[PDB]
From a paper:
Phototransduction in retinal rods occurs when the G protein–coupled photoreceptor rhodopsin triggers the activation of phosphodiesterase 6 ([name]) by GTP-bound alpha subunits of the G protein transducin (GαT). [name] consists of two highly similar but not identical subunits ([name]α and [name]β, Mr ∼100 kDa), each containing a catalytic site and two domains (GAFa and GAFb) that mediate a negative allosteric regulation by cGMP, together with two smaller (identical) subunits ([name]γ, Mr ∼10 kDa) that are the binding sites for GTP-bound GαT (GαT·GTP). [name] is a 3′,5′-cyclic nucleotide phosphodiesterase and a member of a superfamily of enzymes that play critical roles in compartmentalizing cyclic nucleotide signaling and regulating many physiological processes.
We then used cryo-EM to solve a high-resolution structure of [name] bound to udenafil. The cryo-EM map has local resolution peaks at 2.7 Å for the catalytic cores with strong density for udenafil bound at both active sites on [name]α and [name]β and for cGMP bound at their GAF A domains. Overall, the motions of the udenafil-bound [name] complex were similar to what we observe for the apoenzyme. This indicates that the binding of udenafil weakens the association of the [name]γ C terminus with the catalytic sites, due to steric clashes, which would enhance the ability of activated GαT subunits to bind and reposition the [name]γ subunits away from the [name] catalytic sites. Our high-resolution structures lack cryo-EM density for the [name]γ C terminus near the [name] catalytic core, indicating that when large orthosteric inhibitors such as udenafil (516.7 g/mol) bind to [name], the [name]γ C-terminus clashes with the ligand at the active site but remains bound to the [name]α and [name]β subunits through interactions with the dimerization domain and the GAF domains.
Residue numbers in the entry:
A (entry chain A), B (entry chain B): 7 to 817
C (entry chain D): 12 to 34
D (entry chain C): 11 to 34
Amino acid sequence: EEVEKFLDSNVSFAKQYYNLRYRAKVISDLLGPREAAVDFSNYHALNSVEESEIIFDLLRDFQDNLQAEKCVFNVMKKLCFLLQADRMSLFMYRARNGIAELATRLFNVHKDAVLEECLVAPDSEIVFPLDMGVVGHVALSKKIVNVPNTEEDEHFCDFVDTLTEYQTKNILASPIMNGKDVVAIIMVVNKVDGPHFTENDEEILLKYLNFANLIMKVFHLSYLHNCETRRGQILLWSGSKVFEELTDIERQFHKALYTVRAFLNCDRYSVGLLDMTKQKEFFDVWPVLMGEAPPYAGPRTPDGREINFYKVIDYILHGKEDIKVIPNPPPDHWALVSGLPTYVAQNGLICNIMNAPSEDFFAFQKEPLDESGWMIKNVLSMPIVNKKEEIVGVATFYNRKDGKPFDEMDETLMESLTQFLGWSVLNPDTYELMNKLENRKDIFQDMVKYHVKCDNEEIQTILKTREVYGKEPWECEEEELAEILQGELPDADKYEINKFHFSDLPLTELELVKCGIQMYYELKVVDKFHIPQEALVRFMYSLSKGYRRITYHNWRHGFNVGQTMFSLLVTGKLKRYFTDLEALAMVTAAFCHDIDHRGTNNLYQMKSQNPLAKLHGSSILERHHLEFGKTLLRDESLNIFQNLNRRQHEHAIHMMDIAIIATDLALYFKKRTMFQKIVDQSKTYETQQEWTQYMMLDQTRKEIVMAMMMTACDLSAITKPWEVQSKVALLVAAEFWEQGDLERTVLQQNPIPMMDRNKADELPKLQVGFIDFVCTFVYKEFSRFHEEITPMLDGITNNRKEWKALADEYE
Amino acid sequence: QVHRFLDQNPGFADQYFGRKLSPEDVANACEDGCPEGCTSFRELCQVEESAALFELVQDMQENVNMERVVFKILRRLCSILHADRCSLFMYRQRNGVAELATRLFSVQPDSVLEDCLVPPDSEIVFPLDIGVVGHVAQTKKMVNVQDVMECPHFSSFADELTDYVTRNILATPIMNGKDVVAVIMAVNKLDGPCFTSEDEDVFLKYLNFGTLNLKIYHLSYLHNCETRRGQVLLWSANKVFEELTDIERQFHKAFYTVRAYLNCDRYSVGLLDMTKEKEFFDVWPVLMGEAQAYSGPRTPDGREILFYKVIDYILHGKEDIKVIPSPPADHWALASGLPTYVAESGFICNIMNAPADEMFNFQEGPLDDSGWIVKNVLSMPIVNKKEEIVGVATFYNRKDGKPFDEQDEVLMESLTQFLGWSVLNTDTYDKMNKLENRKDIAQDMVLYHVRCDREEIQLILPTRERLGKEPADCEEDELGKILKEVLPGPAKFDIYEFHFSDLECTELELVKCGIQMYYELGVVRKFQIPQEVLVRFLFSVSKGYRRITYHNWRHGFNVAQTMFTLLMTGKLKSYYTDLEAFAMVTAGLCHDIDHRGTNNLYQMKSQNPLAKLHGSSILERHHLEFGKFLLSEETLNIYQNLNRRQHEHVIHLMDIAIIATDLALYFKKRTMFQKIVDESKNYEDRKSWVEYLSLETTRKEIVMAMMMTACDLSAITKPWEVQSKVALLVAAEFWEQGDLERTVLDQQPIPMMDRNKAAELPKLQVGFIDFVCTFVYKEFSRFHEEILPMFDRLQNNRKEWKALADEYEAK
Amino acid sequence: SATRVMGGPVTPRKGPPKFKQRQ
Amino acid sequence: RSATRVMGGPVTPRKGPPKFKQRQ
Ligand SMILES: CCCOc1ccc(S(=O)(=O)NCC[C@H]2CCCN2C)cc1-c1nc(=O)c2c([nH]1)c(CCC)nn2C
Ligand SMILES: CCCOc1ccc(S(=O)(=O)NCC[C@H]2CCCN2C)cc1-c1nc(=O)c2c([nH]1)c(CCC)nn2C
Ligand SMILES: Nc1nc2c(ncn2[C@@H]2O[C@@H]3COP(=O)(O)O[C@H]3[C@H]2O)c(=O)[nH]1
Ligand SMILES: Nc1nc2c(ncn2[C@@H]2O[C@@H]3COP(=O)(O)O[C@H]3[C@H]2O)c(=O)[nH]1
Ligand SMILES: [Mg+2]
Ligand SMILES: [Mg+2]
Ligand SMILES: [Zn+2]
Ligand SMILES: [Zn+2]
């Protein structure tokens, strides 16, 4: 009894004690699967107990996975009792074709209804444009609207009242607002108490719209998140397939659309490619102008081309996947019958169509195309536009997989896809420019080959097969060709082709060509590698034609370098370190070293921005000659190395790249020290045979020796007797003065005294400066290497004496 | 006081609380008739909880009340679970490893948000294998620990760090359907053994609201992140397809445009070198010991890791973008070594708390000014479709100070994946430039071999002998005076007659006559053609023709001569102006302009680059192309003194004239010319007909297109002595192509092109005459009576061949 | 159904279609 | 001060070699 008084006197003390132990039990019971203990089969104001139970019941619908429609309907049923309204409805906000509309989702909701009796299927949808009555007014107003008395108070519509044989006099609606965009509109119609709705009902609606707003907010965000995720995947997957290869437009578009077929969420969709021909040829225009054929009168693209779908790609995803490509589709093709792709190509506008059969503007198929009864219900068509604002194709997307019309999110998804495809038309354009540019290059390269390759009439000046046997060279046996050449080729000893003082002045170009073939014979490489005689003669003659008719770098310079290399191997005994295969490539590389020399320096190619300069950033003319020399060797009739096996061919080529590029003076000035080390080390061996055997094995030092030997041969004109040198000089200076004039007129630059005509009388001073700076090191070391190349050093020393004498006279 | 009594008698407590309460309350309690809701204070708890819970529902509706709502929930969750503290750990994934970082810490019922919100730099991070939080987040189920000591996964990091010791732990994972958002824990203050089963149920039912607010927050963040990624891919693709550029410009454009969506303080893009091997001269120094082999890091492909350019983006306080050509090793982005490490491994690196990282060297302290220190770094490799790392992109401090999470990793990885794939647009750009350069070089190489040089032009001009000056230094009157003394008169080589024969003239004489034909037309003086250009152009055209049996320079001149004699002798000049006669003769000269000796059918069969480049009418488009190319040269441009209108008109005619030489077009447009002839017959006199035809453009083109066909086949109309010889040259060319098809293509040639059927040459010639030649010359003779000699001779030739054909039939 | 429409979605105003322009 | 008693860095009990993501 005492405790009873203590609890009863201090009622507050009994409160938090109840809160301490009996509060968890209350909350757990209330939040569990319980139904509100309020007599909804009545009409009265709710006290705190009933109000709390209604709130708790609405809170109980916040379970996982948030079924949006069921939870909203539950709020609607409670709002029926609280607001004393008769029926409630919900209008989802939707936007297609840029205009907004409201589509019914829940209709005829009363306090004694179920979800199935009020849910609205897409086929039973009622669509309200924003320019209509109270439903449209609320969406535009974004504020509670209370139609208090009757329908004579502006912006009221009678369609649904006639459609549903119902009468609406009292309306109180409010929009569900997701920050700045309207998601749905909730509405009440009529009121079974008497005179409409009071401000209390507006407060009740606002109070209990908090739960409905949260449910729609989750539903709206999940849909937005899913749509944006699909757009990211579409762009990524499309980019992956676009950049896989460089292919034409039909192959590229087919790959991209097929890959992203999962994210589009459509049953069927097809793409029609328009012809891009803007102008016809003259012979196709003549019949029209002369009246033979009537002019074109069909629809035209905005840029001014005839609308002609030449290829249509069809994707079918009904359940039996099928992809077809139709060339020249018939005008009654199922995709093109409606005329919508033609309309899109004509106007270039994005088209969104709901209820395609009921659309009278386009002749859509009202019959089931498929045996399963696949109606065409929703269609969305947009044009594919390249960077020139021309229409490349029309992409059409048919019924969605969920049955709902294409809203603003579907339009944005496919618009990004068509924007990406329209941009990616650049790749097929480059691919078409690819084949044309490659074919044009091959055509011109074949044109050069004819102008340089020796023909059947010119080869008879050396082979003379017609006079001896009466047959053409390609019919004569190798023994017969050898017998003719033996009596035609000049004698090596008589012409002194293996001497360091040999002069080409009293010989003609044909005699130089005959000499060149003889040097190949004297190396015993024709029989060893089974080089065909006709190919050898044709190759040497084509080399004669390849060299330009310029002052110094003509074919005569090419032979003198090649002749010197032959003498260095034979007379200089530098062949003792090299194999027969290498000597064959080394001599051949010398003959082709400055093959298509234009008479201009490497630095000139830098300054004039020649196509050679852009192609070869490094040493230019050395690489250009190497490429051209290989091109001549690749031809069948000119391929000397055609009888060499795989291993020998690459080794022969490898010597050719190094030797030809070694002719650059920039490379020589960098590696001249390494050659000095090699020649210095050569003196640490007891016998010459020991050094030789070491040289056959090491390949890096063989290449460096070969690279230096190219430099010695290239400048070998300085070692010739004074009579030959005095004419070779002033013959290359003429080439330098021509380039100097080119730089003055073309580049508006003052040339160096080496290139200047005004300093012609100062030339001998530069030659001494040239000998003392470049040529002296080449031959001083080589003469130290081999005692047999002493005449080269003796020749240049004599020449420097004469040039110095001339320079002394000038001073 | 009495609390221990009512604890020991649960039956009394339930009985006392089951008693109804008097209307007298203690404090407000929203007493709307709720004193006896089936318990003494259950309704009081019902109303108070509903009012508090509803206020929370209101809070989530606004926006960013996530932390505020959760804190209020945890404040209310405590004191009903009697937990001492309540905390919230957010779930995030970096580097593929999930972490749980603290957002809210110990929450007493009297706490405030400022005392419990955890700044990102002050947060505690746990992995999934440490603590009960990892246990909860891995199994995705509730964990109730009745004693911390017996727990096998408990971690004492936070216990020692703060000061508090934990005894009972109750945690749940807040579930977003499939992913984990957060973990909520309640700790201690049970005043008993542990958390009871009634606290187990209340925790889940009460926290369903917290799941709702966290689900909205998580969805909003996910929706925002996906939106940014979609825009990044769209804007990046827009800039990639703008044009074909190199990797430097393309990466700079894409990264600069998405700088807003990236949401980073700074980020730098470093580009790696793409050279695989080095040239021979770069390998020699390391082989002879002059240099040491590379010992630094290497890419997985095997390249030496060298950054040949670094693009720096600074967005912290002022937008500054720098491009460093040679980035030194002390560069702020590179000094860390992370970009070097990424290039080594190719792994996506995400770093939290950079100054506390010991693996890399992040400079502890401020970079530049304004105290900008590195806190969070994210680096990914840019990899092309060939699985080669072309660059490394490093992203620095997030703009909101949070560590880089999974959403950021996906955002930048998609950007780098897209930009890595788009290297193909840069590889194609480089190969574009090389093909264009190679084509331009080959064109120059062709141009030299076909153009007339200084020495060869002295065969027609001799300016050196007569004046001592080069042709480029002579005035027009002097050049005209010498040409008059050199060029033959109109009465010497029968240039005005239909029976002209070139068998009595040399190639140089044909060239001189060709220049003479231009002089007789009067186009040189009227259009101001420099004489040197005219002579060079004609000589160049002579060189352009190959040295083949029939389609050689002699055939080219014969066609031009017949065109000249058609205009002047045939009186077809009446319908054309001097400008049009200019184009026709020139188009006649260049109609077989490196014709290769084979027809279009062979080009299709042999798959020549001509067949690939030109879809149809090959070898006429080629002849048109090369003839235009020769005229484009400055020294060979005879149209260089024609204005834009006249130049375009002449070029337009040459396209029509040269292409119409194709026999396929002549057959298709044969009847069109016949109608034109018939329209002439409807007129009364030539004066009226001339005035009508000289103004119509389409009719003149068709007539002129037919003139080329008569000129091309003009050898038939030649006298029998000329025709018999020419027909053998044509047969020889056909037999040569017949042999080529038999050997190269292994195809049986037609009887026209068969050596074994040479005895059928007379019979086929008659068939040729009766099928092709008869129509053109019959109508032209009908059109103009001056062309009648050609038709008379054609019939005579047919009689001669028929006599031979009948003779062969006899045997 | 609830909206008393079996066939398809219905709109009070049926006029010439309005189509969206490209971005 | 912060309720976590941690200043200037997100400390972590996990000590070891950092693990980095691999490309997809
Ligand atoms: C006899 C005519 C005078 O000609 C010259 C005048 C001066 C010089 S130079 O070395 O001192 N300055 C050139 C270097 C530049 C750049 C650095 C400074 N310097 C200004 C050399 C030559 C030269 N003479 C040749 O005989 C000769 C060549 N050059 C060549 C090219 C190499 C295939 N071949 N051949 C056979
Ligand atoms: C000299 C021996 C050839 O003489 C001929 C024999 C027959 C024919 S053909 O009516 O049969 N057309 C060929 C059609 C093919 C396909 C079907 C049957 N037929 C075999 C033409 C010619 C002919 N003779 C010429 O003199 C002559 C030309 N053709 C040509 C342009 C030939 C590109 N130019 N020139 C000057
Ligand atoms: N006939 C009918 N109309 C309803 C119902 N629920 C809401 N409404 C709305 O009543 C509105 C009256 O005219 P509106 O133009 O605002 O558009 C009408 C309907 O949207 C319902 O259950 N039946
Ligand atoms: N000081 C404090 N410690 C907490 C709080 N919540 C959890 N902890 C303890 O921190 C520990 C870290 O994660 P555990 O799984 O090891 O178990 C945790 C609890 O023991 C809190 O709100 N404050
Ligand atoms: Mg050279
Ligand atoms: Mg022809
Ligand atoms: Zn040279
Ligand atoms: Zn011809």
